[PDB]
Amino acid sequence: MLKPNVAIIVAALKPALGIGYKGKMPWRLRKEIRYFKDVTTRTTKPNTRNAVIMGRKTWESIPQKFRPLPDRLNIILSRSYENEIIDDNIIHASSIESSLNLVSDVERVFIIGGAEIYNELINNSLVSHLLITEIEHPSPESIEMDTFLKFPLESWTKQPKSELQKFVGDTVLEDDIKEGDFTYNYTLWTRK
Ligand SMILES: CC(C)(C)c1ccc(Sc2cccc3nc(N)nc(N)c23)cc1
Numbered sequence: 001m002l003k004p005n006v007a008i009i010v011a012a013l014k015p016a017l018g019i020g021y022k023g024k025m026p027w028r029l030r031k032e033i034r035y036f037k038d039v040t041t042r043t044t045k046p047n048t049r050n051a052v053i054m055g056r057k058t059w060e061s062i063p064q065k066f067r068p069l070p071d072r073l074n075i076i077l078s079r080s081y082e083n084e085i086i087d088d089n090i091i092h093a094s095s096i097e098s099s100l101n102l103v104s105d106v107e108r109v110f111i112i113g114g115a116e117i118y119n120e121l122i123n124n125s126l127v128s129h130l131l132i133t134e135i136e137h138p139s140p141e142s143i144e145m146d147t148f149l150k151f152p153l154e155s156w157t158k159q160p161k162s163e164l165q166k167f168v169g170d171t172v173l174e175d176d177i178k179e180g181d182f183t184y185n186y187t188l189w190t191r192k
Contacts (some may be wrong), residue, residue, distance in 0.1 A: 001100045006053075007129040008111040008118060009036065010149065011184070014136055018145035019115060023061055026143050029179050032133050035186060038171050039131065040110050041071045048107040051075055053096060055117040073106060075099045077117065096124060115147040122151050129167070130156060130189040137182050156189040164188040 011032055012019050020026065040052055052069055056078040059067065068074035068089045077099065081092040085102055093099030100109070110131075111121050121127060130151070137143060165173060167188055177184050 001103045001106055003126065004100055004106070004109050005128040006096070006109045006111060006121075006124075006126045007131055008122060008127055009039065009131040010113065010118060011036075011133040011135060012149050013140060013143060013145070014134055015140065016145075017149040017151070018140075018143065018147070019113075019118075019149055020147040021143075021145050023057070023114075026145055027135065027180075027182055029133075029135070029177075029182060029184065031174070031177055031179065032184060035133070035171065039168055040069075040112070042169065042171065043107045044169065045107050048105050049073055051091075051100075051103060051106045051109045053077065053099065053109065053111045053117070055114050056081075058112070058114040058117070061114075073103060075103075096121060096126065119150050122149075128190065130187075131164075131167075132187050132189060133184050134187055135182050135184045139181075153189070155192055157192050159188045159190060 010019060011025065040050055043050060049072055051073040053075040056076055059076045073091065074089055075091045075093060077093055079094055081094050083094065083098045083102060084092045086092060091099055091102055111117060161173065164186060173186055175185060
């Protein structure tokens with residue numbers, strides 16, 4: 001596949017855009033996990049699937065029995081990897097672009113994490129869309145976090161919900177979802 005449009009999908013706590021603590025999300029938002037699954041899995045073209053790209057540490061963090069993520073082509077990046085097709089669901093690669101050369105019959109491509117991948121790939125011009133779940137909490141500071149997004153958002157535009165709706169198709173988008181003390185909303189951003 002040549003120069004596909006890629007999207008980053010991430011969940012971050014405002015205002016600092018904290019994303020994790022010692023390799024894990026500092027929250028358990030059950031509806032947000034469901035949205036992540038639907039968005040990354042759904043396709044509109046017939047014999048296609050979507051691809052998910054992740055860093056080797058994220059891959060390793062998923063319990064062996066739960067990988068690869070079903071119904072999507074999983075791509076794992078490592079600087080030590082050779083560009084190789086493991087099976088029909090798993091690709092190893094050392095760069096995003098090299099990995100995309102090995103795919104066909106893919107509709108959308110999503111970067112799913114983790115912290116290092118996000119922070120490095122936000123600056124690759126293949127990235128055209130950000131799907132950011134903006135999480136809010138009454139006392140952000142009480143949540144322990146060690147990793148943060150370092151995104152240049154001054155170079156990006158938050159679109160209206162109609163545009164997000166158009167992006168996700170059939171997926172139901174509820175507003176101000178509450179789970180425990182967290183409130184969140186789904187957003188779409190594109191480059192200026
Ligand atoms: C390293 C950290 C812990 C930030 C990390 C965070 C998330 C993910 S994948 C993921 C899992 C569950 C829900 C998710 N929600 C959205 N919106 N984005 C993701 N990428 C998600 C993989 C790695």
